[PDB]
UniProtKB/Swiss-Prot annotation:
<feature type="domain" description="Peptidase C3">
    <location>
        <begin position="2"/>
        <end position="180"/>
    </location>
</feature>
<feature type="active site" description="For protease 3C activity">
    <location>
        <position position="41"/>
    </location>
</feature>
<feature type="active site" description="For protease 3C activity">
    <location>
        <position position="72"/>
    </location>
</feature>
<protein>
    <recommendedName>
        <fullName>Protease 3C</fullName>
    </recommendedName>
</protein>
<comment type="function">
    <text>Major viral protease that mediates proteolytic processing of the polyprotein. Cleaves host EIF5B, contributing to host translation shutoff. Also cleaves host PABPC1, contributing to host translation shutoff. Binds and inhibits host IFIH1/MDA5, thereby inhibiting the type-I IFN production and the establishment of the antiviral state. Cleaves host MAP3K7/TAK1, resulting in inhibition of TRAF6-triggered NF-kappa-B induction. Cleaves host TICAM1; this interaction allows the virus to disrupt host TLR3 signaling. Cleaves host IRF7, resulting in inhibition of type-I IFN production.</text>
</comment>
<comment type="subunit">
    <text>Interacts with host IFIH1/MDA5; this interaction inhibits host IFIH1.</text>
</comment>
<feature type="active site" description="For protease 3C activity">
    <location>
        <position position="148"/>
    </location>
</feature>
């Protein structure tokens, strides 16, 4: 409807796949080459389904900060025959707050879904499903089940992936450029 939705759509149409694990269907953001991200609670194993195609997982790393605290991001390298468009230049370098974000989801259940979530706070610490978690972004939107892995963007930046909510607020794990240096 506006330039926020324009940038979100541009990311969704080229840099997302539908990922299916034994824990459900997730929006999955492809970042560069065959490297993608997904919430760690997706529990990626040796095989994952990508757009309903059986795909070998070449590597999967559940990220933690240097305090050894959960970040709720898993970086997956996929045995896919095609590279993602490289979007690492849209990732923030530092932890920050943002104005006017969009949460975008694409699954069987929620195709072509875009939500204007408004202001995004650097929330920091969250007890997420009982697990201490750092680098959390918060937005005042009542997100539900089905949105995990959704991409959080501003104009020009990809800032996070949706990992949970409390019925009133939604929570995203930060994406930082430093996670994807090769
Ligand atoms: C994904 N949530 C959803 C889905 C269908 C209808 C309404 C909603 S909402 C975000 O407005 O509570």
């Amino acid at each position: 409807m506006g330039p926020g939705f324009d940038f979100a759509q541009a990311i969704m149409k080229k840099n997302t796949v539908i990922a299916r694990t034994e824990k459900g269907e997730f929006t999955m953001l492809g970042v560069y080459d065959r490297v993608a991200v997904i919430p760690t609670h997706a529990s990626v194993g040796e095989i994952i389904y990508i757009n309903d195609v059986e795909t070998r997982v070449l590597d999967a790393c559940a990220l933690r900060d240097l305090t050894d605290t959960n970040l709720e991001i898993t970086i997956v390298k996929l045995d896919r025959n095609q590279k993602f468009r490289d979007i690492r230049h849209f990732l923030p370098r530092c932890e920050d707050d943002y104005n006017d974000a969009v949460l975008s989801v694409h699954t069987s259940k929620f195709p072509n879904m875009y939500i204007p979530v408004g202001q995004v706070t650097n929330y920091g610490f969250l007890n997420l499903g009982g697990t201490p978690t750092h680098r959390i972004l918060m937005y005042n939107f009542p997100t539900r089940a089905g949105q995990c892995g959704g991409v959080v963007t501003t104009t020009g930046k990809v800032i996070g992936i949706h990992v949970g909510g409390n019925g009133a607020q939604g929570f995203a794990a930060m994406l930082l450029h430093s996670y994807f240096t090769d």
